[PDB]
């Protein structure tokens, strides 16, 4: 390709009636910067009209609309694909070039756009129009189940995926999507290894995607209190071996170092996790994983700013702007006034999309008690505040009652709430104290204002 | 059918699973396996 580039830089300057030179330009530049391919097809479109009145072949308008489909010019790519269809339809004598296949690819990109254009129905219908004419196509059959997978992992999505595998079992994408099915319900933790070791045969082998999916399903087994039973350490070492293997065969595999740093962080080697995650960040910080792992390293310094900055950055996407796990990661070192009082707000925002979780209803009570004792212990606080603190304490006590009746917990029994209830009772006694303090300060301020008013009467 | 070989032969797919897992940057493993071994040597 370097030689092709250097030859194209020689044909680009001189003009020996260049006609297809920009085509060969864009044919290389579609891996490189997408704008260069666009500029080449833009000039190639008009260069094909001066010699004769000849319409643009559908293949170029198709490739240019496929370029624009990766961009935000989705409607413009849509017009390109429409025009490619109309043009490829006009090719009644191009049976050698198979105008039909050109229309096929154009319609595929068009349904992929409608899928992407918030118009799942048009994508469904176009994909079915390919099915009705060519059921031997895979991606039309897969993207259809993808659309239904939005509504749920149990609709004909799953069926069409399996059926796709039966027609083409040697299709690594369909198979990977199979294993992706089990990732919804992680109850198939250990049993996924069999389904993942199917196409690990040497004809497929060096499939880094399977190897990493293996290390991921193996990493999920970490974060267990059974580490002292010499059980999680072996799992760590095994996943580390997987990662070292996918490293030797792919030094650029950023997910390999991603999991290496994950296991190092589980080792508590957060600085070794820090800088490996930093190298991942340098290579591509965009991936959702780094915004979490890096923030979880920065928050581990107990002092943090970047952590909440990175938590904000990952939530910028529309995927889960309302999110519980991010606030559970963030609800840490909650003792600063802007951490206590603000984290109530973010806990409420999370709970208003997920009120059924026990952990939100528990942490909101813990932060309530943290604040209430931050003003009902010693503080010469504002007067209104001691009225408000007993209200918050009452609601905390109500939650403490309500939580105790719930059966299921965060994989950890909440039987230890008795100490929260005791803290509640003694904070109530401190409230009954500090409201006396409140009245004494009230009379103090009243006599202060009176003794000032008299001075003004003197003047 | 021929529609399969008609399309799979002209298609010019540029990205795939592995190309996402690979860094496009110059971070090979010389700067990665180094610390990976050093921390094992601390143990």
């Amino acid at each position: 390709r370097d030689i092709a580039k250097g030859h194209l830089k020689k044909v680009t300057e001189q003009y020996p009636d260049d006609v297809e030179a920009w085509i060969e330009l864009a044919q290389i530049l579609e891996q490189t910067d997408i704008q260069g391919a666009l500029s080449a097809y833009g000039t190639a479109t008009r260069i094909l009209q001066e010699k004769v009145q000849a319409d643009v072949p559908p293949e170029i308008l198709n490739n240019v609309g496929a370029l624009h489909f990766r961009l935000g010019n989705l409607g413009e790519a849509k017009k390109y694909f429409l025009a490619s269809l109309d043009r490829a339809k006009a090719e009644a004598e191009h049976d050698e070039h198979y105008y039909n296949a050109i229309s096929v690819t154009t319609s595929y990109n068009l349904a992929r756009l409608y899928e992407a254009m918030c118009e799942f129905h048009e994508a469904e219908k176009l994909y079915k129009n390919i099915l009705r004419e060519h059921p031997n196509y895979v991606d039309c059959y897969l993207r259809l189940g993808a659309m239904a997978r939005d509504k749920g992992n149990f609709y004909e999505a799953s069926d069409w995926f399996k059926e796709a595998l039966q027609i083409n079992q040697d299709h690594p994408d369909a198979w990977s999507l199979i294993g992706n099915l089990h990732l919804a319900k992680q109850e198939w933790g250990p049993g996924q290894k069999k389904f993942e070791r199917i196409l690990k045969q040497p004809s497929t082998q060096s499939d880094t995607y399977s190897m990493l999916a293996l290390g991921n399903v193996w990493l999920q087994t970490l974060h267990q209190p059974t580490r002292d039973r010499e059980k999680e350490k072996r799992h760590q070492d095994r996943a580390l071996a997987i990662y070292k293997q996918v490293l030797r065969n792919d030094a650029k595999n950023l997910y390999a170092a991603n999991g290496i740093g994950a296991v190092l962080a589980h080792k508590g080697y957060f600085r070794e996790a820090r800088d490996v995650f930093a190298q991942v960040r340098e290579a591509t910080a965009d991936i959702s994983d780094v915004w979490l792992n890096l923030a979880h390293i920065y928050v581990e310094q107990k002092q943090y700013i970047s952590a909440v900055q990175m938590y904000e950055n990952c939530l910028r996407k529309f995927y889960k702007h309302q999110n519980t796990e991010v606030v559970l990661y963030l609800a840490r070192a909650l003792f600063k006034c802007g951490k206590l009082q603000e984290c109530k707000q973010t806990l409420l925002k999370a709970r208003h999309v997920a009120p059924s979780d026990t952990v939100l209803m528990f942490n909101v009570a813990l932060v309530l008690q943290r604040l209430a004792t931050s003003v009902l212990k010693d503080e010469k606080s504002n007067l209104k505040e001691v009225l408000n603190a007993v209200k918050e304490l009452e609601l905390a006590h109500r939650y403490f009652s309500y939580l105790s009746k719930v059966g299921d917990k965060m994989r950890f029994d909440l039987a230890l709430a008795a100490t929260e209830a005791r803290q509640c009772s003694d904070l109530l006694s401190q409230a009954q104290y500090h409201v006396a303090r409140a009245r004494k300060q009230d009379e103090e301020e009243r006599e202060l204002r009176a003794k000032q008013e008299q001075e003004k009467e003197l003047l | 059918v021929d529609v399969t070989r008609d399309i799979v032969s002209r298609e010019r797919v540029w990205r795939t699973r592995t190309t996402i897992l690979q860094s496009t940057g110059k971070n090979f493993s010389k700067n990665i396996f180094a610390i990976l071994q050093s921390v094992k040597a601390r143990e």
């Binding site: 579609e30 293949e59 496929a66 897969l142 993207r143 970490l222 994983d289 | 010019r12």
Partner: peptide, 25 residues
């Protein structure tokens, strides 16, 4: 307070989906 906030802090990393590239020709 007697404890910090309870948290199942786990260093997770997902995998990407198949890119389903547009079929350039």
């Amino acid at each position: 307070e007697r404890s910090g906030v309870v948290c199942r802090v786990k260093y997770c990393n997902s995998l990407p989906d198949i890119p389903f590239d547009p079929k350039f020709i």
